[PDB]
Amino acid sequence: QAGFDLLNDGRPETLWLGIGTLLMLIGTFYFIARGWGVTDKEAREYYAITILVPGIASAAYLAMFFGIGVTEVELASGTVLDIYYARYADWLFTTPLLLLDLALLAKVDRVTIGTLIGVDALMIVTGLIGALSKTPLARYTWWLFSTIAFLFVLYYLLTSLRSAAAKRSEEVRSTFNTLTALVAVLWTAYPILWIVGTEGAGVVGLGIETLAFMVLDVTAKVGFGFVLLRSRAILGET
Amino acid sequence: QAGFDLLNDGRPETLWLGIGTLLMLIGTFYFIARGWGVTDKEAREYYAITILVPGIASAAYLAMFFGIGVTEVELASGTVLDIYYARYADWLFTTPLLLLDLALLAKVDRVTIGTLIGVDALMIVTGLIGALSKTPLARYTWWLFSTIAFLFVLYYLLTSLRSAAAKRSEEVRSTFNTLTALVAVLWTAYPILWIVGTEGAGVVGLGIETLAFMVLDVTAKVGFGFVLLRSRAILGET
Amino acid sequence: QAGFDLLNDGRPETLWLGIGTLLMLIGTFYFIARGWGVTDKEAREYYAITILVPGIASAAYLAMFFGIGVTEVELASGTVLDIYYARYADWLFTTPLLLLDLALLAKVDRVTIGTLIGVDALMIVTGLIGALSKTPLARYTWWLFSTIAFLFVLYYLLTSLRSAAAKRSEEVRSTFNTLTALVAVLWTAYPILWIVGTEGAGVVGLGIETLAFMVLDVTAKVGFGFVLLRSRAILGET
Numbered sequence A, B, C: 001q002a003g004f005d006l007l008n009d010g011r012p013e014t015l016w017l018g019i020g021t022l023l024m025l026i027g028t029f030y031f032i033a034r035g036w037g038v039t040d041k042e043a044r045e046y047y048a049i050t051i052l053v054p055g056i057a058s059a060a061y062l063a064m065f066f067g068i069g070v071t072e073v074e075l076a077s078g079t080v081l082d083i084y085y086a087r088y089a090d091w092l093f094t095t096p097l098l099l100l101d102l103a104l105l106a107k108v109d110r111v112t113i114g115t116l117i118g119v120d121a122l123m124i125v126t127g128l129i130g131a132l133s134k135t136p137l138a139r140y141t142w143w144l145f146s147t148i149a150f151l152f153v154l155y156y157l158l159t160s161l162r163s164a165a166a167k168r169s170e171e172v173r174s175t176f177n178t179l180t181a182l183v184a185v186l187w188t189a190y191p192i193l194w195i196v197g198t199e200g201a202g203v204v205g206l207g208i209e210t211l212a213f214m215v216l217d218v219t220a221k222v223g224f225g226f227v228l229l230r231s232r233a234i235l236g237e238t
C-alpha cells in the first residue's frame, strides 16, 4: 500500500503530499475570501490567526512534496528511515496558533496563553529530536518526553481553558467544546501514528502514514477552521 | 565584474560584504548615539526597533563575509551555486521590524501587525526554501510562492496601514508616506535581483549581485532608519 | 580529568550531562509542584516563566547527553573540536526568560523588555556562529561581537532595570538585587569558560568544561529560580 510517484523520484507518497498541499491552499484562500469583508475586530482576529495555519501548512506540504522537506536518518543498526522533518517545522507554528484560537474563545489571561505555547513548542521540538535520533533508546525517550508535554497541554485545555469558556455565553461555550473535543481526539492521533509508523515500530508504511497525516492535518486545519469561522462565537458576544 | 578577494579564499564579493558589514555597524552605533539621550517613550520605541535592524544585519553580513553564512547548493543538473543563506536569516527578523516601524507610525491594531509579520515571515522562509532547492520547477515555484506573500504585504501596507496613517497628524502622515514609498520600491527590487541573479536566470554575476544587495540593504536599513529617526513624527504627536 | 562514559561512546563528559539533565528535571517538577496551588496572577507569571527555563534546559541537556546535541567542527588547521551546539539553542530561549523575570520584578515598560531580549538573542546567536567557525580570526571576532552585546545587556540591567526596581517596595527591591548580582557574576563566567575551554585557548578539558557549565547552568537555573520563587516579592506588593 502506497500511492503514486508524482515526481518520478521513487516516492509514491508524494501523491498524498500533493493532495495535502492542494487542500491546504484552497483552505487558505477560502478562509481569506470568506473573511475578506469582516470588519469585526474580534472576528478578524480569529480569521487572521486561522488563515495563517493552513497557509504555513501549505508551505510545509509543498516542501515535503518536492522532497526538500525530507531527510534520510541512518539508525544505529544501519536501517535508513525517511524522516519528513518539515512536519515539525509546520507544527512548531501551527499548533500554538490553533491553541491561540482556543485561548481567545475562552478569554483566558496572557499567562495561560504563554504557558500553552511554551509547553506545546517543547512538545514539537522534542518530537523532532526523537525523529532524528539514531538510537532506539533515544528515539523512544524523546517520544515519551514530548508526550508528557502533550499531557500538560491537554490538561490545561480541559481545565483552565474549559472552566473559563464555561463562564462565557452559550454560543461561545458551545463552539469551544466542539473544538477542544476535536483537538483532544485528533491531536492524540499524532503520537500514535508516530510510534506505529516508520519513526517507530513501523507496522504502518510510509505511504499509508503520509495519507493518514494528510487526513489528520486537513481535518485539524481546514476542518477546525471551518467549524470556527462558521460559528457566531467569533462575533463579539451576546 | 566582481570585486576584491579580501580573505584569499577565492571570493571577490567579500569586498562588498565587508563594506556592507562596516556600513551596518556604523549605522547601528550612530543610531544608538543619536538616540542615547531620548526620554520620550514613543521615540525610544522607534529607536529601539530601528537600532536592532542594522544590528542584526551586521551579524548577517559579517557571517557572509567570513564565509560562514554561505553554502554550496548543487542543482539537479550538477551546476553549483553559492547561496548566501544568511541573508534570509537576516530578513526573517529585519523585515518584520521595519514593518513594525511602519505599523507604529500608522497606529494600527495588534491584529494588523500580527498579520504583516506572519505573512512577511512566510515570504522570507519560502524564499529560503526556493534558494536551497535543487530543481528549477521547485526553485521558481517557491519564488512565485514567496512573491504572492509579498503581494499581500504590500497590499495591506498601501491600504490598511496607509488609511490609518492618513488619519494622523500631517507630520506623522508625511513620514509614513516617505517610508512606505521607499519600502515599495526598494523591497520590490529583491525578488528581481533574485530571479536575475545566480539564484535564478543568472544574467547577473555573484559579484555584482552582492554589490546590489549591499546597496539595497544599506538603503533599506540605514537610509530608512535615517529618514525615520530624523523626523518629528517619532515624537508623540501634535 | 574527565568523568564517566555513560553511553559507551567514548564521551566521559556524558556523566556531567546526565547529572545536569537529572538536576534540571527535578528542578522543573519541584517548581511545578511548589507553584501548583498558586492563584495569584502575578506569582503564577513568575512561576510559569521560571518553570519553562529548567524545562527547556532539560531538553537541551538530554540532547547533549545522547550525543544528538553535539557536532564535530573541523578547524582550518585540521584540529577537530566537539561543539555542544545544543547549549546555544538552550540559551536562545532561557536567557530571555530569566531576563524576563528580572524585567517583571523591576516593572519596566515593554520597550525595555524588547530591547533586552533582542540584544540577549543577538549575544547567543553570535556566540553560536563563533562556536561553529573554522578560522581563529572568525572564532574570536564572534566572541568579541557577542561580548559587546552582553555588555549592553549587563548595562541596562544595572541601570534601567536597577533604577526602576529601586522605586518598588523593599521586599521587591531586595529580591531584585539578589538576582541581578547573581546574574552579573554567574553569566560573566560563560564567556570566560568559553575562551579558556575547547572553543578557545583550550586550557580546560572538555570533561572539566562540561562539569563547569553544568554547575553554572544548574545555579543560574534552579538556584535563581529557588531564590525567586521563594521570595515574597513575587506576590503582588505591599
Ligand SMILES: CC(C)CCC[C@@H](C)CCC[C@@H](C)CCC[C@@H](C)CCOC[C@@H](CO[C@H]1O[C@H](CO)[C@@H](O)[C@H](O)[C@H]1O)OCC[C@H](C)CCC[C@H](C)CCC[C@H](C)CCCC(C)C
Pocket: A071, A085, A089, A092, A117, A118, A119, A121, A122, A123, A125, A126, A129, A132, C052, C053, C056, C059, C060, C063, C068, C069, C070, C071, C072, C086, C089, C090, C093
Ligand atoms: C525551537 C527553536 C530551537 C528553533 C526552531 C526550529 C527550526 C530551526 C526548524 C529547523 C529544524 C532543522 C534542524 C531541520 C532538520 C534538517 C535535517 C536534514 C538535519 C538534522 O540534523 C539536525 C541535528 C544536527 O546533527 C547532525 O549533523 C551533524 C553534522 O553533520 C552530524 O555529526 C550529526 O550526527 C547529525 O545528527 O541537530 C538537531 C537539533 C538538536 C537536537 C538541538 C536541541 C534542541 C533544543 C533542546 C531546543 C530548545 C527549544 C525549546 C523547546 C523552546 C521552548 C521555548 C518556550 C519556553 C517559549
Ligand SMILES: CC(C)CCC[C@@H](C)CCC[C@@H](C)CCC[C@@H](C)CCOC[C@@H](CO[C@H]1O[C@H](CO)[C@@H](O)[C@H](O)[C@H]1O)OCC[C@H](C)CCC[C@H](C)CCC[C@H](C)CCCC(C)C
Pocket: A052, A053, A056, A059, A060, A063, A068, A069, A070, A071, A072, A086, A089, A090, A093, B071, B085, B089, B092, B117, B118, B119, B121, B122, B123, B125, B126, B129, B132
Ligand atoms: C521560520 C522557522 C522555521 C525557523 C527560523 C529559520 C532559522 C532556523 C534559519 C536557519 C536556516 C538554516 C536551514 C540555514 C541553511 C543551512 C544550509 C547550509 C543547509 C540547507 O539545507 C537545509 C534543508 C536540509 O536538507 C539538506 O540536508 C539533508 C541531509 O544532509 C540532505 O539529504 C538534503 O538533500 C539537503 O537539502 O532543509 C531546509 C528547511 C525545509 C525546506 C523546512 C520547510 C520550512 C517550513 C515550511 C517553515 C514554516 C515556517 C512559517 C513560514 C512560519 C510563519 C509563522 C507565522 C504564522 C507567524
Ligand SMILES: CC(C)CCC[C@@H](C)CCC[C@@H](C)CCC[C@@H](C)CCOC[C@@H](CO[C@H]1O[C@H](CO)[C@@H](O)[C@H](O)[C@H]1O)OCC[C@H](C)CCC[C@H](C)CCC[C@H](C)CCCC(C)C
Pocket: B052, B053, B056, B059, B060, B063, B068, B069, B070, B071, B072, B086, B089, B090, B093, C071, C085, C089, C092, C117, C118, C119, C121, C122, C123, C125, C126, C129, C132
Ligand atoms: C535566531 C534564529 C536565526 C533561529 C534560531 C536558531 C535555531 C535554528 C537553532 C539551530 C541551530 C543549528 C544551526 C544547530 C547547529 C547544527 C550543526 C551540526 C550545523 C552547523 O552548521 C551551521 C552552518 C551551516 O554551514 C555548514 O554546512 C554547509 C553545508 O554542508 C558547509 O558547506 C559549511 O562549511 C558548514 O559550516 O550555518 C550556521 C548559521 C549561519 C552563521 C547564519 C547566521 C545567523 C544570523 C546572523 C542570525 C540573525 C538572528 C538575530 C541575532 C535575531 C535577533 C532578533 C532581535 C532583533 C529580536
Ligand SMILES: CC(/C=C/C=C(C)/C=C/C=C(C)/C=C/[C@H](CCC(C)(C)O)C(C)(C)O)=C\C=C\C=C(C)\C=C\C=C(C)\C=C\C=C(C)\C=C\[C@H](CCC(C)(C)O)C(C)(C)O
Pocket: A111, A112, A113, A115, A116, A119, A137, A141, A144, A145, A148, A149, A152, A156, A160, C006, C007, C008, C025, C028, C032, C035, C036, C037, C038, C044, C045, C047, C048, C049, C051, C052, C055, C056, C058, C059
Ligand atoms: C521538561 C518536562 C516537562 C516540562 C513541564 C513544564 C515546562 C510545565 C509547565 C507548567 C506551567 C508553566 C504551569 C502553570 C500553571 C499556572 C496556571 C496558568 C497561568 C497557566 O493558567 C500552574 C498552576 C503554576 O501549574 C518533562 C520531561 C520529561 C522527561 C522524561 C520523562 C525523561 C525520561 C528519560 C529517561 C527514561 C532516560 C533513560 C535513560 C537510560 C535508561 C540510560 C541508561 C544508560 C545506558 C544506555 C545504553 C548504553 C544501554 O544505551 C545507563 C544504564 C545509566 O548507563
Ligand SMILES: CC(/C=C/C=C(C)/C=C/C=C(C)/C=C/[C@H](CCC(C)(C)O)C(C)(C)O)=C\C=C\C=C(C)\C=C\C=C(C)\C=C\C=C(C)\C=C\[C@H](CCC(C)(C)O)C(C)(C)O
Pocket: A006, A007, A008, A025, A028, A032, A035, A036, A037, A038, A044, A045, A047, A048, A049, A051, A052, A055, A056, A058, A059, B111, B112, B113, B115, B116, B119, B137, B141, B144, B145, B148, B149, B152, B156, B160
Ligand atoms: C502559487 C502557489 C503554489 C504554486 C504551485 C505550483 C505552480 C505547482 C506546480 C506543480 C507542477 C507543475 C507539478 C507537476 C508534476 C510533474 C513534475 C516533474 C516530474 C516534471 O518535475 C505532475 C505533472 C503533476 O506530475 C502557492 C501560494 C501560496 C500562498 C499562500 C500560502 C498565501 C497565504 C496568505 C495568507 C496567510 C494571507 C493572510 C491574510 C490575512 C491574515 C488577512 C487579514 C485581513 C484582516 C485585516 C487586518 C486585521 C490585518 O487589518 C482580512 C480582511 C481578513 O483579509
Ligand SMILES: CC(/C=C/C=C(C)/C=C/C=C(C)/C=C/[C@H](CCC(C)(C)O)C(C)(C)O)=C\C=C\C=C(C)\C=C\C=C(C)\C=C\C=C(C)\C=C\[C@H](CCC(C)(C)O)C(C)(C)O
Pocket: B006, B007, B008, B025, B028, B032, B035, B036, B037, B038, B044, B045, B047, B048, B049, B051, B052, B055, B056, B058, B059, C111, C112, C113, C115, C116, C119, C137, C141, C144, C145, C148, C149, C152, C156, C160
Ligand atoms: C566588535 C564588532 C566587530 C569586530 C570585527 C573585527 C575586529 C574584524 C576584523 C577583521 C580583520 C582583522 C580582517 C582582516 C583581513 C585579512 C583576514 C585574513 C586573510 C588574514 O584572515 C584584511 C587585512 C582586511 O584583508 C562588532 C560589534 C557589533 C555590535 C553590535 C551589532 C551591537 C548592537 C547593539 C544594539 C542592537 C544596541 C541596542 C540598544 C538599544 C535598543 C537601546 C535602547 C535605549 C532605550 C532605553 C530602553 C527603552 C531600552 O529602556 C537607548 C537610550 C535608546 O539607548
Ligand SMILES: *C/C=C(C)/C=C/C=C(C)/C=C/C1=C(C)CCCC1(C)C
Pocket: A091, A094, A095, A098, A123, A124, A126, A127, A128, A130, A142, A143, A144, A146, A147, A150, A187, A188, A190, A191, A194, A217, A220, A221
Ligand atoms: C496541524 C497540526 C497539528 C494540530 C499537530 C499536532 C501534533 C501533535 C499533538 C503532535 C504530538 C507528538 C507527540 C505527543 C510525541 C512525539 C511526536 C509528535 C510531535 C508527533
Ligand SMILES: *C/C=C(C)/C=C/C=C(C)/C=C/C1=C(C)CCCC1(C)C
Pocket: B091, B094, B095, B098, B123, B124, B126, B127, B128, B130, B142, B143, B144, B146, B147, B150, B187, B188, B190, B191, B194, B217, B220, B221
Ligand atoms: C533589510 C532587508 C529587507 C528590507 C529585505 C526585503 C526582502 C524582500 C522584500 C524579499 C523578497 C523575496 C521574494 C518576493 C521572492 C523570493 C526571494 C526573496 C526572499 C528575495
Ligand SMILES: *C/C=C(C)/C=C/C=C(C)/C=C/C1=C(C)CCCC1(C)C
Pocket: C091, C094, C095, C098, C123, C124, C126, C127, C128, C130, C142, C143, C144, C146, C147, C150, C187, C188, C190, C191, C194, C217, C220, C221
Ligand atoms: C541558563 C543559561 C544562562 C543564564 C546562560 C548565559 C549565557 C551567557 C551570558 C553567554 C555569553 C557568551 C558570550 C558573552 C560570548 C560568546 C559565547 C557565549 C554565548 C558563551
